[PDB]
Amino acid sequence: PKRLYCKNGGFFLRIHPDGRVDGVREKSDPHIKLQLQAEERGVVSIKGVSANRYLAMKEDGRLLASKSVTDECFFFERLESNNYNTYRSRKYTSWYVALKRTGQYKLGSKTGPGQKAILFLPMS
Numbered sequence: 001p002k003r004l005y006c007k008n009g010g011f012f013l014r015i016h017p018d019g020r021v022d023g024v025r026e027k028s029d030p031h032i033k034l035q036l037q038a039e040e041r042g043v044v045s046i047k048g049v050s051a052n053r054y055l056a057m058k059e060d061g062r063l064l065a066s067k068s069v070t071d072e073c074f075f076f077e078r079l080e081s082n083n084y085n086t087y088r089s090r091k092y093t094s095w096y097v098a099l100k101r102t103g104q105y106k107l108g109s110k111t112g113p114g115q116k117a118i119l120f121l122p123m124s
């Protein structure tokens with residue numbers, strides 16, 4: 001599994017068993033272990049290992065994690081020039097997976113390039 005360390009505050013992306021998404025700084029949290037699975041080159045799904053749920057971005061920018069894999073569950077994974085990764089919705093293509101400084105997720109419609117919120121380092 002991987003954990004996704006967000007540059008914005010040092011929060012790891014967390015997927016709760018019930019589908020809620022947020023961030024936490026605890027490396028020991030069971031709900032931050034993720035499986036990043038390649039769908040094709042540069043395209044991934046993000047599954048919470050504990051939750052058996054896949055990260056999804058909704059049409060209004062909400063993040064949540066669903067039991068089923070749908071078209072809202074795929075993301076462009078890009079290694080940026082600063083060597084952080086970004087995860088951009090394959091369906092809503094201007095919007096990024098992001099965490100705010102409070103550890104709450106950032107609405108997709110409020111994200112974009114240049115923001116710290118969208119930058120993640122995957123780690124083992």
Ligand SMILES: CO[C@@H]1O[C@@H](C(=O)O)[C@@H](O[C@H]2O[C@H](COS(=O)(=O)O)[C@@H](O)[C@H](OS(=O)(=O)O)[C@H]2NS(=O)(=O)O)[C@H](O)[C@H]1OS(=O)(=O)O
Nearest residue numbers: 007008009098099100101102103106110114115116117118
């Ligand atoms: C360089 O890091 C970016 O800016 C940080 C900062 O200026 O504090 C921080 O931004 C968040 O906090 C600011 C200030 O908050 S407050 O007014 O003191 O309460 C917010 O203005 C900002 O929200 S907003 O959408 O820009 O209005 C917050 N951004 S966050 O994504 O919600 O965290 C962040 O560390 C970072 O912002 S980022 O570049 O948009 O990620």
